From a paper:
Especially, exposure or modification of N-terminal amino acid residues can mediate protein degradation and the resultant proteolytic procedure is called the N-degron pathway (formerly the N-end rule pathway). Two tertiary degrons, Asn and Gln, are hydrolyzed into the secondary degron Asp and Glu by N-terminal asparagine amidohydrolase 1 (NTAN1) and N-terminal glutamine amidohydrolase 1 (NTAQ1), respectively. In multicellular eukaryotes, Nt-Asn and Nt-Gln are deamidated by NTAN1-encoded NtN-amidase and NTAQ1-encoded NtQ-amidase, respectively. In this study, the crystal structure of NTAN1, the last veiled structure among three amidases in the N-degron pathway, was elucidated.
Although yNta1, NTAQ1, and NTAN1 do appear to share catalytic functions commonly involving a conserved Cys residue critical for the deamidation activity, they exhibit low sequence similarity to each other. And we explain unexpected substrate specificities of NTAN1 based on structural and biochemical analyses.
Residue numbers in the entry:
A (entry chain A): 2 to 114, 117 to 305
B (entry chain C): 1 to 4
């Protein structure tokens, strides 16, 4: 079940009321929102994209920071077993929450080294016109509470709790967060370098791929592939529309995106056009694209 | 955010 201050959460319930009713949740929300955004460098960084998962331990020598960005209607979930330090950061978008939370629990339940507890963190979203962040918080709190293990909700800065307004238009306060693995500390962050194969991994989610695990903590490798997808319908039609009609249909929040999000869409749609089926074209021998952390903390191809 |  999902616990707050040692007591169980009664569901359904909005996160705003859940935070107001419990001081330590409000304490974390006031602090997290007041943080000036940090520019996290590429050293020791493991960037998680939308609909991706990454789990590791402080015993890792390569990775020391997990993080994700561009969370408008998504929720960046952080699960961590305190004591041993097994940390999992995923970028949940709500395509299939019923099957994604078991992926998060299993990523942590394999690390067994008893001591500590399970702490979960929920950040992102705003009050959008489509009630997407509200439905995603509902699903995430219900799937965690349906679990057997006791999970303690520590952070909950989502939707109404993460919303700001300019010119009578709403958009989120926190677009991304980084979590430092050695010290279990979460903070607002931006990411200039977003790891290798950005267009390949983004096109996988835009084509309709499911949530995947992108890091193997045993070998400390980044494993991108192999991916296969149906050719995206009407790639040339969307590659010729204006910026306004691109955000309205390819984005879950047309007016709440960070700048140059259309460039991200056009670049990603361009990738799907050149590679209609990347099954046996980008992955020779059907082996994944393997990466390891450099001496200088960068992702270098093996 | 991307709509699947």
């Amino acid at each position: 079940p999902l616990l707050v201050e040692g007591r169980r959460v009664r569901l359904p319930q909005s996160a705003g009321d859940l935070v107001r009713a419990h001081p330590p949740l409000e304490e974390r929300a006031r602090l997290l929102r007041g943080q000036s955004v940090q520019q996290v460098g590429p050293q020791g960084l493991l960037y998680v994209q939308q609909r991706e998962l990454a789990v590791t331990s402080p015993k890792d020598g390569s990775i020391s920071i997990l993080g994700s960005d561009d969370a408008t209607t998504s929720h960046i979930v952080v699960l961590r077993h305190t004591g041993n330090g097994a940390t999992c950061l995923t970028h949940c978008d709500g395509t299939d929450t019923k099957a994604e939370v078991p992926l998060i629990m299993n990523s942590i339940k394999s690390f067994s080294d008893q001591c500590g507890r399970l702490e979960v963190h929920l950040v992102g979203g705003f009050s959008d016109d489509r009630q997407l962040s509200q439905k995603l918080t509902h699903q995430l709190l219900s799937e965690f509470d349906r679990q057997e293990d006791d999970i303690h909700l520590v952070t909950l800065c989502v939707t109404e709790l993460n919303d700001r307004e300019e010119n009578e238009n709403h958009f989120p306060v926190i677009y991304g967060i980084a979590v430092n693995i050695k010290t279990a500390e979460i903070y607002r962050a931006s990411f200039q370098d977003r790891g290798p194969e950005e267009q390949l991994r983004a096109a996988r989610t835009l084509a309709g791929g499911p949530m995947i695990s992108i890091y193997d903590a045993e070998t400390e490798q980044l494993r991108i592939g192999p991916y296969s997808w149906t050719p995206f319908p009407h790639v040339d039609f969307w590659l010729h529309q204006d910026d306004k009609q691109i955000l309205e249909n390819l984005s879950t929040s047309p007016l709440a995106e960070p700048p140059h999000f259309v460039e991200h869409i056009r670049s990603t749609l361009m990738f799907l056009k050149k590679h209609p089926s990347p099954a046996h074209t980008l992955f020779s021998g059907n082996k994944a694209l393997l990466y390891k952390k450099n001496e200088d903390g960068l992702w270098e191809k093996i | 955010n991307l709509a699947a």
